[PDB]
Design a protein around this ligand. Structure first.
Ligand SMILES: O=C(O)CNC(=O)C(=O)O
Ligand SMILES: [Mg+2]
Ligand code: NI
Ligand SMILES: [Zn+2]
Length: 331
């Protein structure tokens, strides 16, 4: 079995290997990449997402989110307080202000220490889940706005035609902006490109060990656990690497830099933080290997998780028994 220790693998495709997305994902899996839950893909040196980032300041962040923490430094939840709209130019200024800027640090490890020590004492502002793309339409390889859709994959695999579309989202981050522990909707894959700015640190649990994370989460967030049998779908809970190590949960960490892709694999729990002002783009996708994960994905039916239009068909077709109860949570 390839990659039995579930290490995060890093790939360096040639420009020739960068032509066929599906084939390259399947190659990575042949080498065991999926076992980690997360892989890094460094694009060929000839490749570019677009010519420059000079003209992005007028993108609107219609609902910036202030991420307010509660709990203790290594075990906390965050809630998202909606703030007034601002442009990317305004947001970049805000991220760079004395109140919100990255502190002096030695290296990524020192910054990671400072994040876990101090995150809860600040409330950074995140521009998340903004429908759109920063890939030039003329970028033909690994353009996250031109991937094959999850609906077409399900049709090709299963023969059922369904409604729904599949489009990318932009994330504008600052120091301490945080993504809570989660898997993707319907345990899909995700791909994330860091277009510009400061890094993003990721933590990931191997898919084969996801239930160990869930068990710990139920212990650490006991009221949330009683409220919902899939409360990690709410995307609000954080657990530090120190805490994971204390409880014997297998995980790995890696820092993504501007110009690099990360792929998360089905049922790979992941969490992370941004080092400073940055812009990422991400999208879910599917492969044939995903189908069985989609059929087994947990679902939130308490009403908190509230997700896209397109998830309806996935639940309806892959999880008909759950559909009724899940839909009640949706409405
Ligand atoms: O970059 C972020 O804030 C969050 N991204 C993801 O969880 C992802 O790409 O799956
Ligand atoms: Mg603009
Ligand atoms: Ni994700
Ligand atoms: Zn729920």
């Amino acid at each position: 079995a390839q990659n039995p220790n579930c290490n995060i693998m890093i790939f360096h495709p040639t420009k020739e290997e960068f032509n066929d997305f599906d084939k390259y994902i399947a190659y990575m899996e042949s080498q065991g990449a999926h076992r980690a839950g997360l892989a890094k893909i460094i694009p060929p040196k000839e490749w570019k997402a677009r010519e420059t980032y000079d003209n992005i300041s007028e993108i609107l962040i219609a609902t910036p989110l202030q991420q307010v923490a509660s709990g203790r430094a290594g075990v906390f939840t965050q809630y998202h307080k909606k703030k007034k709209a601002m442009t990317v130019g305004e947001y970049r200024h805000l991220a760079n202000s004395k109140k919100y800027q990255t502190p002096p640090h030695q290296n990524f490890e020192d910054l990671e220490r400072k994040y876990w020590k101090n995150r809860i004492y600040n409330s950074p502002i995140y521009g998340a889940d903004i429908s759109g793309s920063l890939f030039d339409e003329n970028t033909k390889q690994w353009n996250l706005g031109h991937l094959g859709t999850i609906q077409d994959l399900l049709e090709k695999e299963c023969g059922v035609v369904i409604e729904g579309v599949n489009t990318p989202y932009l994330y504008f981050g600052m120091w301490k902006t945080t993504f809570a522990w989660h898997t993707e909707d319907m345990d899909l894959y995700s791909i994330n490109y860091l277009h510009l700015g400061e890094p993003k640190t990721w933590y990931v649990v191997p898919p084969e060990h996801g239930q160990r994370l869930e068990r710990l989460a139920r212990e650490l967030f006991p009221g949330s656990s009683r409220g919902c049998g899939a409360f990690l779908r709410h995307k609000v809970a954080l657990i530090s690497p120190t805490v994971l190590k204390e409880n014997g949960i297998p995980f790995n960490r890696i820092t993504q830099e501007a110009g690099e892709f990360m792929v998360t694999f089905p049922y790979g729990y992941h969490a992370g933080f941004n080092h400073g002002f940055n812009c990422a783009e991400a999208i879910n996708f599917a492969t044939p290997r995903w189908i069985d994960y989609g059929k087994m994905a947990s679902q939130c039916s308490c009403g908190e998780a509230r997700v896209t239009f397109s998830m309806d068909a996935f639940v309806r077709i892959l999880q008909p028994e759950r559909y009724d109860l899940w839909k009640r949570g949706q409405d």
